[PDB]
From a paper:
Deacetylase from the extremophile Pyrococcus chitonophagus has been analyzed by X-ray crystallography, small-angle X-ray scattering, differential scanning calorimetry, isothermal titration calorimetry and NMR to determine its structure, thermodynamics and enzymatic properties. It is a hexameric, zinc-containing metalloenzyme that retains its structural integrity up to temperatures slightly exceeding 100 °C. It removes the acetyl group specifically from the non-reducing end of the sugar substrate. Pch-Dac crystallizes as ‘a dimer of trimers’, with two doughnut-shaped trimers stacked back-to-back along a molecular three-fold axis, with a 8–10 Å channel through the middle of this assembly.
Orthorhombic crystals, Pch-Dac-anom, used for identifying the metal cation, have one hexamer in the asymmetric unit. The presence of Zn2+ in the crystal structure of Pch-Dac was confirmed by X-ray anomalous dispersion. Energy scan performed on the Pch-Dac-anom crystals revealed X-ray absorption profile characteristic of zinc, while anomalous density maps clearly identified the Zn2+ sites as peaks at the level of 18–25 r.m.s.d. In Pch-Dac and Pch-Dac-anom, there was no ligand in the substrate-binding sites and the coordination sphere of Zn2+ consists of the three conserved His-Asp-His residues and a single water molecule that occupies the same position as the carbonyl oxygen of the substrate’s N-acetyl group in the Pch-Dac-lig complex. The same hexameric assembly is observed regardless of crystal packing and probably represents the biologically relevant oligomeric form of the enzyme.
Residue numbers in the entry:
A (entry chain E), C (entry chain D), E (entry chain A), F (entry chain C): 1 to 267
B (entry chain F), D (entry chain B): 2 to 267
C-alpha cells in the first residue's frame, strides 16, 4: 500500500515502525555481547562508563577495543611514551574491572598517528568477525569542534568496519582461515551532541568518577579541579533532556540511515 | 556598493546583479552534463528521475563511475571480479532506460577510493576532454554519510571542477593537447539542504524499474525495504517542492564553495 | 561542591566563568605575540587583515605562517607555477608591510597538495615551540561548504599543532636539540560562520582592500569587479552581528571545548 | 669457538655444527610448504616441476597468490575484472595438474601490490594459521627484475617469515587465537645464484602443459617465444646441476638474511 | 627442434639470435623517435649528451622527459627553490638547443620528493602513448652505490611505464579519451656500470662539456675543477671497453630479460 | 692537463689522489665528532662496537642516533612492545657507557615500521645540522641478502640526510629557527660485504662481546650459543682481509662516488 502514501510524516512512521522494526524504547532488547571502541585508554569510561556498569550488572558481556597506546598524553618530561603506554594499560585494566569489563583488545597504533586506512578497517573487522557482537558503541565522528584526529578517525573507521564485516569480498583472507562474515544488529554513538536515547547514571555517577580517576597519569589532583566539574556538567546536559540529574546520551539509528538518507537527522 | 550599510541589501545585490545567480531556471544554456557516481547505481538512485527529464529535453548526460562496485554482495559464491562484470552490464542496462549513452569507468576498487591528487587528475582529464556545461556530484556534507567512497567522491568532484581551469594543474594534460575548461553549473544530489526541486511523480515508476535493473543489489527480499525507503526519500523532497515525489538538488554560485560564511543562507 | 548543582544552565555558567575563567569581552588581554596561519598567500589579509592592522598598531607582534607556495592560482597559460610562487612571495611581503607584519615562515608545500600528515604537524609545532606565541589564528575547518582541501587541512593541522606543542613525547627531537614544549593561551578561528567575537574594521577597511589588492596576480581589474562587493558583503555580515558597518568575525572557545564537549556549539 | 683464528675453519664449523645447515637433503622434516607467487602462473613457471615432485612424495603444497592478474592482456575487449575470473580458473586448472589443492587469493590488483605493513600482516596471518614447515618465494635480488610486484613479493615474503614468530607483530592475530609460528625452511626461486637443484627432465612435459593451462597468457604466437625461453632457463639450471633440465633454488640459514657479510659465500 | 638441445650455451645463442632477433651491432636500426628520461635537469646531457647530438645529427627526433624541477640543487641561501626551478628550465632549454632537442615534457615533481607511485607511471604512460616513440633511454636503477632516490625511482618508473603502456587495462581513461596502447621497440640504460654497447663521442666531447656547462647554477668554476676530470674519467672508462678515447656506455637487452631471466647478466 | 690523458687506469689514479685527495691510509684524519646511525638498539655495538671503543679512547666524540624503539624484538608472549622498548633503552644506555658513548638521540619510529619518507630524512638532517659532525657511520644499504626493511631504509635515509643537510632549500624551517646547513667530511658504511678499510679489534673483542651481551633481552644464554660463534666468525672474515685475527670492515668512498659513478665498485 506504500505506493499510495502522499504524506512524508506517515511514510516515515510506517518505514521506522513496520518496515525496519526500529525501537528507541528498548534498543538493547536482544543484545548479549557489545564492543566499546575507544580511541584512547579512558575514552570508554569518560564517554559511557555509567552505561557500561549498568550493562554488565544486567549480565551483558562488554568488550573494549582500544585503537591507540595513549603514548602522548603527559606533560611530564620524565615519562617516555613507552613508559606511559605500560602505565595506561594497567590503568585501563583497573578502570575496566570496576565496571564489569574483562576483555580488552589493544590495536597498539600510536596516539596522534591513528591512520584513516583500509589497514585499520581490516584490524577492526577481524575482531568483529571473531567476537560476533550484537552491538557496537563508537564515538560520533560528527561531534562539532572535535579537533583530535584519533577521535574523528575512530568514529569513521568503526562505522566502516560494521558496514564491511558482512561483505565476504572485504578482507577475504579472514574467511579463508575460517572466520565468518558477521552483521551487527545495533550501533550506538557516544560523545555525541545529537543524542536520541538516554541512560540514567545518577545512582552509579560516584563509581564512574572513581573509574575515571583510576587513570592517575591523566587525572592528577590539579587537572581533576577542572575535569570533575566538566564531567558533571556533561552529565547534567544529557540529564536535562532525559528528565534526571545525571545521564549519558547515545545516538541510535537504523543501519540504513548511515547511507544516502537526507532525513537521518530527523530522529 | 561602498555606500551600503545593511547586509540583507548587499546580499540580494551580490546574488542578483553581481553574480547573476538564477535558482528559477539554473540549467538555462546547459547542453552537456557529467553525473559523478561513487558506485554503479548511485546516479539512478540519487537523481535517475531528473536524468530521464534531462535526456528527454535533449541534454547529453555522461556518467563517471569512480569504483567497480566489487564489494556490494553478501553472497560467498560471487568473487568481486565476477560482481564488477555483473554491475557493469547492470549500469549499462539502467543507463539505456534513462537517456544515457556514455559511461567512464575509473576502476578504483569499491571501499578503496583514495582522496588523492591522482583521482583529481583522472576527473580533470575527463572534464577537459568532454568540456561539460554542468556537473552533478554527491553532497560530501550529507549528515551521517558513513561510506568513505561517497565522502571522497563529493570532495574530489568539487576539487576537479575548481582545478580544471588552472593551466598549472596536471600540466601534461595541456602538453598532449587538452585545454583548461570552466564548468558553468554545479549541482549536489543526495543532499539534506536542497534549494531546487524536480517533480519526478510522472517518471517515478521508470526510476524504480531502472534501479531494479541492478539485480545484484536489489533481490526481492532487499527490495521489500528499499522500495518504501526510496519512496520515503522522494516524499521528503516532495513536501519541500509542493508535489508527491521529487529529487532535491543544492545549487550555489562557484564562489560560495570557498570562504563564504553565509553560504548556507541560500 | 558542583555535586549539589542539578541544573545544566547553572553548571555551564559556573564552568565558563569560575573553572575555565573564559572571557569573550577582552579575550586578547595578555597576548603580545600571535601566529596567523594561512593556507595560501593572501588568506591572512582577506580573512582578518583589518584585525592584523589594529593588532600591530597596538604593538602586538603578528607573525605569518604560510602553508603553501600558491603555485596553482593563475589561469594564464604563460606563467609556470614556479614563476607564480616567486610573484606571490613578493606580493605577500608587500601586503604584509602595509599591515604591521615583518616575519613570514614559508612551509613551501605545493598549492592543492597540502598533506594532512604527522609531517606538517611537526613543521608547525617546531615554529610554535621556537616563537612561543601567546595566541594562534587559523581558518575554521568546519566552515560549511569549504571545498578547498588546503583550507580544511590547515585548520585541522593548526588545532593539532596547538594541542601537541606542549607534549614532550610529540616530535621529541625538537626538545633534544633544545626547543621547549609551549602552551598557547589563545585560539581564534577566522573565515568562520559561527563567530562569537567581533572587531570593528570600518576605519581600516580601505587599507585592508589596498593590502588585498597588493596580490595583483590574484586580483586583476575584472576579478576585482566581483570580489570588492563580495568582501564588503562578508564585512557587513559580521557587521550586523557586531552592531557596526564593517567587522571581522572570530570564533573563540576554551581549549577544553575542542575535545569531547557536546555543548561546544552553545557559546 | 673462542680459540679459532682462521675464517675458513670457523665458517665450516658455524654451518655444520652450530647451525646444523644441510644442503644435501634440506627438505628432511618438511610435510607442508607455502609457494608465494606475485601473479597467477608464477609458481608453475618458476618451480612447477619441483611442485609436482613434492606433491608426488606426499608433501602438501599451498599457493598464496598476491595479485588478481588484472593487467596481463593486450586484448582491448577483455576488462581486468573479466581477465581476473579467467586467470583464477586457469590457476585452479594448472594447480590440479601439479598436486595443489589450496590457493589463498590476497586480491591486490596486478601492478599495484603495495610494499606495506598491511600486506605483511595478510601473509603473517596465513603463515600462523597454516603453520607451514617451509616457504618458497621469488628472489627479490634477481638482477634486472623490472616488475614491481616481483620485487615487493620477495621482500614481503621474507618479512612475513621473519615477523611471524614475534608475538608483538600483528598482536590482534594472537588475541583472536592464532599462535606465533617459526618456518624451518626458506627457498628462493626465480634466482640467478642457486645453490640447490631439482632434476625436472622427467616432468618437463607436464610443467609445460601446466604453464599452457594459462591460455590467456600463452596463445600460440606468444608460446613460439616462451617454449624456447622456458627450455633455455631449465638448461641454465641444468648445466649447474649436471642434468638436462632443472629448477634452481637458493637455500640459506634464516640467520644469513640479516647482517651477514659472507651470506654470498654459500 | 629446440626440444632436442642438451647444451645451455647453444640454446642461449639460438634464443638471442633466432627467436628474439637481438642485435647489439646496430640496435638503433628502426628508431626515428626516442624519449630520454632524466630525473633532474642536466641528467640527459651528463649521461648521454654526446649520443643525443650524434642522434639528432642523423635526423632522429629526441624528446626529453624531466621528472623533477631541480628545486633543491643549490648551496646559495639567497635562491629559493622556485627561483632555482625557473633558472634550471632556462638552462636545460639552452643545453637542449645545443644538442638537437626541441621538445621537453616537465612532470614538475619536486627534487628529492619523486614518488615511486602508480600516479607517476600514469604520467609517463600518457606521454609514451601520445608520442609513440620507437625507443626510450632511462638511468639504470641497478647502478651500484646510487644514493639519489630520484635516480632509483626514475629508472624503475620508466621500465614500468614501457612495460604497462601496451596494456589497455592500465590507465584505461587514456584510451577512453582517444590515446592508443603503444609498444616501445628499444630500451637503453645510461649511467650504467654493466654496459654492452658503446657510442664514440670523442669528436663531440667538447660540445657535450659546453652543453653541461650551460647549467651554470650546477657548474660554477670551483665545482667544474672536480667535474671536468670526473666526466672525462667516466668517458675514458666506457672508452677502454669500446676501443676509443671517449665513449658513452649503454645496456641494451631484449624486453623479455627484464623479467624472471636468471641469465640476464650473461649479455 | 686532464683532457690529454688517453688511459682510464691513469685518469682514475689521478682523479682519486690529486683531484679528490682521497686517503684510505688515514681517512679519519681531522674527525673529532662522528654520528653512528643504528636501525635498532644494539646495531651500532654489533656492527662497529670495537671501532667505537677505539674512537672514544682517542678522545673522538661518538653520538648514537637510534631510528627505532626495538618494540618487536622478543619471542616472549608476556613482554608487550612498550615494556620491551623501555628495557632496550636502559640496555643501550648501559652498552653505550661501556664504549665511550654519552649522547643518544631516539627517533622512536616503531621497529619493522621505519618509513622511507621525506619526514625521517628531515629528522636526521635536523640532528646533522645541530651537532655539525665531521663524519657519519651508517649501515651499507647494498648488503647482499639483507631482509630487514629497517636496515635497508636506515642506510638509504642516512645517505640522503648527509647529501641534503648542506642544501638550504631542504627543510627550510630548520634555517628559519636558526640551524645552518652543514657538510659532513666523512661517510663510513658498516655491516658491509665490500669493505676497503679495517680496524683491528683483537685487543677489545672481549669488551665488544660484553657490551653486546648488555642487551640481555636480545641475548639470553640459549640465543648466545649461536651468536658468540657468529660474531667471532664475522670478526674473522674482516680479519683475514686486514691480516689480523679479529677486525671490523668499513667501506669509505668519496662523496662524489655515491652519484652516477660507473667505476664506484673499483675502490
Ligand atoms: Zn581520546
Ligand atoms: Zn554508493
Ligand atoms: Zn572549454
Ligand atoms: Zn586560500
Ligand atoms: Zn612557553
Ligand atoms: Zn609475475
Ligand atoms: Zn607453530
Ligand atoms: Zn640527477
Ligand atoms: Zn603504437
Ligand atoms: Zn672561468
Ligand atoms: Zn638491527
Ligand atoms: Zn656546519
Amino acid at each position: 500500500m506504500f505506493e499510495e502514501i502522499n504524506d512524508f510524516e506517515t511514510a516515515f512512521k510506517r518505514l521506522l515502525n513496520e518496515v525496519l522494526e526500529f525501537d528507541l524504547q528498548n534498543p538493547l532488547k536482544d543484545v548479549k555481547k557489545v564492543l566499546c571502541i575507544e580511541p584512547h585508554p579512558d575514552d570508554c569510561v569518560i564517554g559511557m562508563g555509567g552505561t557500561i556498569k549498568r550493562l554488565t550488572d544486567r549480565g551483558i558481556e562488554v568488550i573494549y577495543i582500544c585503537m591507540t597506546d595513549g603514548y602522548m598524553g603527559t606533560t611530564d618530561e620524565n615519562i617516555t611514551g613507552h613508559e606511559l603506554a605500560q602505565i595506561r594499560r594497567k590503568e585501563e585494566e583497573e578502570s575496566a574491572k570496576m565496571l564489569g569489563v574483562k576483555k580488552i583488545y589493544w590495536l597498539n597504533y600510536r596516539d596522534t598517528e591513528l591512520p584513516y586506512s583500509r589497514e585499520v578497517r581490516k584490524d577492526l573487522v577481524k575482531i568483529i568477525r571473531k567476537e560476533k557482537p550484537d552491538g557496537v558503541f563508537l564515538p560520533d565522528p560528527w561531534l562539532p569542534y572535535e579537533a583530535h584526529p584519533d577521535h574523528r578517525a575512530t568514529g569513521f573507521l568503526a562505522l566502516d568496519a560494521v558496514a564491511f564485516s558482512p561483505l565476504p569480498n572485504f578482507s577475504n583472507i579472514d574467511l579463508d582461515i575460517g572466520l565468518k562474515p558477521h552483521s551487527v544488529s545495533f550501533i550506538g554513538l557516544y560523545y555525541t551532541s545529537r543524542p536520541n536515547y538516554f541512560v540514567d547514571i545518577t545512582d552509579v555517577m560516584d563509581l564512574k568518577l572513581k573509574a575515571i580517576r583510576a587513570h592517575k597519569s591523566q587525572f592528577p589532583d590539579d587537572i581533576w579541579e577542572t575535569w570533575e566539574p566538566f564531567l558533571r556538567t556533561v552529565a547534567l546536559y544529557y540529564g536535562q533532556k532525559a528528565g534526571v540529574k545525571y545521564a549519558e546520551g547515545f545516538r541510535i539509528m537504523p543501519g540504513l540511515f548511515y547511507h544516502i538518507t537526507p532525513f537521518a537527522e530527523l530522529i
